[PDB]
Amino acid sequence: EDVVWRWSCDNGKCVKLKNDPRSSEPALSLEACKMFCNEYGLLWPRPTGEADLGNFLSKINLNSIEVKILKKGATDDLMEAAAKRFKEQVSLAIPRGSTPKLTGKAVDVYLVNENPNEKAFSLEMDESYGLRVSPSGADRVNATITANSFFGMRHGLETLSQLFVFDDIRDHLLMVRDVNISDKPVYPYRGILLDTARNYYSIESIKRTIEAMAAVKLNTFHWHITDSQSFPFVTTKRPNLYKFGALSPQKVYTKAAIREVVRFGLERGVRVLPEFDAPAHVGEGWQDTDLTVCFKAEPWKSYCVEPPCGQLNPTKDELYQYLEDIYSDMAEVFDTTDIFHMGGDEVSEACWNSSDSIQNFMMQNRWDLDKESFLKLWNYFQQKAQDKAYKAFGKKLPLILWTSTLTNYKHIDDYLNKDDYIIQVWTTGVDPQIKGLLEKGYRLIMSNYDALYFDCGYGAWVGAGNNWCSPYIGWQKVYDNSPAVIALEHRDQVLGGEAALWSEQSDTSTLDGRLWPRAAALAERLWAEPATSWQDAEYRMLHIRERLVRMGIQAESLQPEWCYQNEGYCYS
Amino acid sequence: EDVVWRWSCDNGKCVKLKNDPRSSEPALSLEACKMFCNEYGLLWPRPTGEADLGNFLSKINLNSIEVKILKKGATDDLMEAAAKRFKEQVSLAIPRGSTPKLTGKAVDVYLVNENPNEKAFSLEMDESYGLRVSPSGADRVNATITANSFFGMRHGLETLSQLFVFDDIRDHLLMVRDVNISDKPVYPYRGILLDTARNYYSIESIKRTIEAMAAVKLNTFHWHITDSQSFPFVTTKRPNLYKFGALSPQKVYTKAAIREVVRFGLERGVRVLPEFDAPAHVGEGWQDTDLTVCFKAEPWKSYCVEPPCGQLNPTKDELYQYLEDIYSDMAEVFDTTDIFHMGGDEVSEACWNSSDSIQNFMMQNRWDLDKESFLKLWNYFQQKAQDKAYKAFGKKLPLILWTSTLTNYKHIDDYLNKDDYIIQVWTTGVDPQIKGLLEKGYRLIMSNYDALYFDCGYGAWVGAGNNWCSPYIGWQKVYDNSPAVIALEHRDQVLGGEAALWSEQSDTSTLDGRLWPRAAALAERLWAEPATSWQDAEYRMLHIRERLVRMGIQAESLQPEWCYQNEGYCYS
Numbered sequence A, B: 001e002d003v004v005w006r007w008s009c010d011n012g013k014c015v016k017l018k019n020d021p022r023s024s025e026p027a028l029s030l031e032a033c034k035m036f037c038n039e040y041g042l043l044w045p046r047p048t049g050e051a052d053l054g055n056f057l058s059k060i061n062l063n064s065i066e067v068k069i070l071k072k073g074a075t076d077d078l079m080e081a082a083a084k085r086f087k088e089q090v091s092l093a094i095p096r097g098s099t100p101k102l103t104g105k106a107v108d109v110y111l112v113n114e115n116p117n118e119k120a121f122s123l124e125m126d127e128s129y130g131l132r133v134s135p136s137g138a139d140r141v142n143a144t145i146t147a148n149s150f151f152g153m154r155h156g157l158e159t160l161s162q163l164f165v166f167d168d169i170r171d172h173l174l175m176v177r178d179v180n181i182s183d184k185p186v187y188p189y190r191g192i193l194l195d196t197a198r199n200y201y202s203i204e205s206i207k208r209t210i211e212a213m214a215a216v217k218l219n220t221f222h223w224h225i226t227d228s229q230s231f232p233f234v235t236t237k238r239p240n241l242y243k244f245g246a247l248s249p250q251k252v253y254t255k256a257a258i259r260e261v262v263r264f265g266l267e268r269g270v271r272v273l274p275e276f277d278a279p280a281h282v283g284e285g286w287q288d289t290d291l292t293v294c295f296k297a298e299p300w301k302s303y304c305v306e307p308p309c310g311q312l313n314p315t316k317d318e319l320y321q322y323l324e325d326i327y328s329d330m331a332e333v334f335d336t337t338d339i340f341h342m343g344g345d346e347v348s349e350a351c352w353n354s355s356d357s358i359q360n361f362m363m364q365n366r367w368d369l370d371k372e373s374f375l376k377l378w379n380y381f382q383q384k385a386q387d388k389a390y391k392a393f394g395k396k397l398p399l400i401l402w403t404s405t406l407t408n409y410k411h412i413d414d415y416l417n418k419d420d421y422i423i424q425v426w427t428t429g430v431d432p433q434i435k436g437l438l439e440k441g442y443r444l445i446m447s448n449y450d451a452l453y454f455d456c457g458y459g460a461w462v463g464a465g466n467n468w469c470s471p472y473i474g475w476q477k478v479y480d481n482s483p484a485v486i487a488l489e490h491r492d493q494v495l496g497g498e499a500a501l502w503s504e505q506s507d508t509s510t511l512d513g514r515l516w517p518r519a520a521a522l523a524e525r526l527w528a529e530p531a532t533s534w535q536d537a538e539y540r541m542l543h544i545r546e547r548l549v550r551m552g553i554q555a556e557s558l559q560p561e562w563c564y565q566n567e568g569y570c571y572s
């Protein structure tokens, strides 16, 4: 039947009241109240510059929205795709099953791309935009988006779609009447790491992930595509790696599938950044090559962080021929990325020391067999691997390594340099390594495990109890985790942050819940770096969760819906 | 392309080996190896009596499976529906996208229902069955299921479907050749509680839940349909309760929808058991009746366990007219249930003491205003509510109450009796209340919160941190939680157990992950009460997870699939 309630703004809270017939005051639907009762309405993330939403809503005709591209260029196809996608975005205001009345004003959306040829991802790219909405004539609306690039422009389209509300009391589609917004992200790298080697993820699920990322302006999909458990990446030059390495013949990422994901990303302002983790975290796929050591080594606890063990043998010249080929095949299909992730996490000394061929190589080259001499071998590997990476991508490009024994700030300059290597941090946000690295001029991607590890909290996957980084990290904690606080005066060296979904206990079935809506908390933190805390964003976070669900995302539930309908009553 | 590996059984573990062409030994697919390498093959739950799977598999034609009902009766429609559903179940052995070769033997399934008129749920119902599979003639298979009732018979069909394996090396559908199984559950009550008031669950999602329950022989769906947050139950006699109480007009459970769920349950051996929680856990829907107190009382911490507060006013005679009507409407559509849950959790004394009309009632009836006098008021309420319940269902039937101040074993006999009231336990499995209740002759449903609360572990929903009963309970812990251990010599008084999905932080989007595959661990514990621990069931648990995923259930991921393919290598 019909909705029985109405909402009224009182001290920044929409209070549910009986919609009693004996009243001359127009009843407000829940979302209509929220749009003006909340400081930033229903927007997520909130803008960084002008955020003027005015006071009124206008009824609009869904079938009368026209998008006009005013400046043509090389991004024509991307702008046209983004425009076509806009009506679809607007319909997300309308709950499934409900139908708006096809009456009201026509909306003219004007897209002004200041540099219409620009379509490359880069850390220096301009993601800023201006958004203005105002009445136009008697019967229409003028929505104008102005941006320096396509990427800023499609962010602007995202924000604009959030300015539509469905009045489910009257069945009207509404739009904010008077809008002045200026906006740009605080950090250029706003990412999610997806491990697709510990478990397989359907390419459908990967695209869906990119859809939700774009909804909250996340711009980087870090595809951790290989590990010791599987090799799903289809390398044409070294086909045995995926043939032996895949969990099944269908659990694979073909060139055509990767091209699809990469293009799907590009259209949505998301760079797809591949990782080949080396020289640890290899195993499956490398059988019969003699290019690994310790694969499935037992007892595993003596040789690696988690089963199965397995590491590359850096002493074999043929290895770098394989690496060159893998990197070249990656470069071919991951052709929007400006950066390459080379892993470098958790290298085992004990594993390398257990190999005869490796020991013979070190003794003959005048190195000892102690813990620090294996760091020489690691450098030897990384330098040669690095060379192949540059050759593959046809240029010098920034490379990423995880924090590790190698990247210890005390000796990092012996092996790496700050211009060539970005460091992905997965220590606590308080670990001494962060300041030490920043003082040496290094650029960081923040993935501190106490706030940004989305896999934490579930049961143990080896033995019993809970997994290693438990407890489960609530959105409140990921929201309050501030790179500006962690880095202080060196904050410009922080390129941004990344939520990590390791997949020992996640796959196609669970990725919607793992990522959403928690990655939206990171999205606002990185977009706006608010001085305010999670409580000030709580109401808008509850709304963005509902929006993801309307998109078809199986997002985690945060609170009873009663709390969403009754702001202020659920607190501690 | 084609699968490259084969598996060989070694010390109870399927080890992955190269399927090398220069071999005279037939290569075994992963599942084919598991079926005979594991003590109980791919079965879940494992049988309680005979569990003879023989040594061989036969190739069968998918399109040549014929089900024959040998004894007709009143359950004809249920038997025919269960039979029609069998082909569908068999196809769950085949991974999506794969096609079996339409060659091999024909399968004749013979269904022998010993009492074909019997279709009532009861704690005394016979869920036993016998399963025999053997070759028949030259080109067919004889699968015979013999059971004392329809319910035992459909359990037998479930087990039988698990005896099919897809060989993905050869693309053959296989079936265990020689089977002798006898089986019956240790406990008659094997349940899941679904709270659909703290958040709404689509009826599609509820049916899907019943599908997965039936797959592992769970037989009781405890529908916690109302609470203080919402009233989605469509009561025709008191329509304002759902009109004011529902989260939206579409977030409702109509008579037709409930009849659908109840029938869907019946066909699958699942009783749908409704709960009307009283006299606490009421609120939304009751506005303008003056039949509640403390609704939305602030500060909530002084008046209830969680917001919003709200309790029935037992002093109003009209209340029991409402209750009679609600219970009668429930009885009409929940017409397969043999038991009624009346809640009785977490009654607030402070809430009742804050009411003038309540205080006046107690002072005039010679009761004090101290903590124990409110227990008199609670008894007064429960007795009258109980009377209405019996009237509604047209008979005396067992009633369930939660453990609470009322059900404290020390005084429980003053208020309740063991014949009329079943107690649902949500204390720790070690709490003194359990033994005290059992020694007084009480029957229990085990839902101890340290092992059976499926909501635990996530972020806080009020304030920050994690929810109240964190950490997250892994399947290992729910598996090892034994009612036989908890109850000892009084174990026949344990009717069984129930996994509780409270929904402050769960809805349509998350229920597959919340319940599965963890509720399968409860399913085996309650079906078989194994003396063995979780490690002995680990491999079969990993398989049942995959089966749920094939069913379209978005089940939680337990381990890297690599571990499933490489038994023994993932341990701690």
Ligand SMILES: CC1=N[C@@H]2[C@@H](O)[C@H](O)[C@@H](CO)O[C@@H]2S1
Pocket: A345, A346, A402, A426, A453, A455, A469, A502, A503, A504
């Ligand atoms: C860098 C890192 N390398 C490891 C990953 O391989 C695991 O999957 C993850 C699980 O939390 O832990 C650390 S983070």
Ligand SMILES: CC1=N[C@@H]2[C@@H](O)[C@H](O)[C@@H](CO)O[C@@H]2S1
Pocket: B345, B346, B402, B426, B453, B455, B469, B502, B503, B504
């Ligand atoms: C009986 C019980 N009553 C309460 C429920 O209303 C909550 O939803 C649940 C959350 O874990 O905690 C206890 S259990």
